[PDB]
Structures are given as C-alpha cells and as structure tokens.
C-alpha cells in the first residue's frame, strides 16, 4: 500500500508523527504511542475530529489524509 503521515498531539502539546498505510488497524499506532509515553494503553483515549478511534479502525475507514491530527486524552468515567 502507501502511507500517510498522522500527527498525534498530547495533552502537553507534544507531538509524535506516525507513517501508516491506509489499511493498517490503528491499534498498532495506539500501542506505539503509549509505549513511548510510558503509560498503559488503556489509560489513554485517541480521538479523530473528536470521535473515538477503535482498535480495528483504519485511516481509510475514518477518511484520514496526509498530515491529519489525532488528539490523545486520558480515559474517562463510564464506557
């Protein structure tokens, strides 16, 4: 396939960029980000246009393009 570059913005305004294929499940991006922050993956929620990114979402499914932004927040009360 071919790759797009996504920018992941943290609560402290820091950024890590990820190159990902249009068909790759975004679980792998979440794991890498959490690993690099040194926190459990389940302590974080990952949002695209404010909507929750699921483990089996792909960039194609979400309509993501080159240089789109993902925001990371702490997980919230409830489901």
């Amino acid at each position: 396939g071919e790759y797009i570059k996504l920018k992941v913005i943290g609560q402290d305004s820091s950024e890590i960029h990820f190159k990902v294929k249009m068909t790759t499940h975004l679980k792998k991006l979440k794991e890498s980000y959490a690993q690099r922050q040194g926190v459990p993956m389940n302590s974080l929620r990952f949002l695209f246009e404010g909507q929750r990114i699921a483990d089996n979402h792909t960039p194609k499914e979400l309509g993501m393009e080159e240089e789109d932004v993902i925001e990371v927040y702490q997980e919230q009360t409830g489901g």
């Binding site: 890590i16 960029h17 990820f18 190159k19 294929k21 068909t23």
Partner: peptide, 12 residues
C-alpha cells in the same frame, strides 16, 4: 524545543 519524531508503523 523538541526534535521531529516520525515512527513507521508496520501492517499485520
């Protein structure tokens, strides 16, 4: 100021 960080994610 932080340097640029780009990580390549592989498929399955």
């Amino acid at each position: 100021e932080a340097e640029e960080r780009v990580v390549v994610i592989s498929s399955s």
